[PDB]
């Protein structure tokens, strides 16, 4: 599948849930791109204006595209592969409730899940693993990535 052909990558945080405090939505979606350059040679950016490759955006419903969101629960965020456009894009339901801690759904870890699909990354059947199709909660000052991410990421880049 495609993988961003560039180093320096960009995003922007095209709107704000509602659920948390701004600083807290700027601080979960830049450790989360953290998680993924700790272990690439990517380097993420992030930009306030004109087009960002990784656009960020909370949406709920029907949301012009063609993944549609399904109410609290379900579907919790969808991103697209690298590419041009809505390449690389994340999108996360706003009817969730978003957060910084174990209440609701955590940001940060849901952004980190979303952001391997933006740089290319399919999902493993290792229940460890950040990418495993369903999300499951964990202590997120503590997080580390799994072995099976690690050389996931590191076939696609590095
Ligand atoms: C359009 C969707 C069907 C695909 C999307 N779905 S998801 O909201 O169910 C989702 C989100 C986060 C995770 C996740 C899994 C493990 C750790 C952290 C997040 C898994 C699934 C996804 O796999 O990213
Ligand atoms: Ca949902
Ligand atoms: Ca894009
Ligand atoms: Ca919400
Ligand atoms: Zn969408
Ligand atoms: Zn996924």
Known sequence: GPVWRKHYITYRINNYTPDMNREDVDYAIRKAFQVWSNVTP???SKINTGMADILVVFARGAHGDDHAFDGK?????????????????????EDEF??????????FLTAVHEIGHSLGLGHSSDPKAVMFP???????????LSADDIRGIQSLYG
Request: glycine share 20%; proline share 2%.
């Open 42 to 44: 990517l380097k993420f």
């Open 73 to 93: 629960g379900g579907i919790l965020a969808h991103a697209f592969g690298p590419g041009s456009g809505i390449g690389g894009d994340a999108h996360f339901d």
């Open 98 to 107: 978003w957060t910084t801690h174990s209440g609701g759904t955590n940001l």
């Open 134 to 144: 369903t999300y499951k909660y964990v202590d997120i000052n503590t997080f580390r």
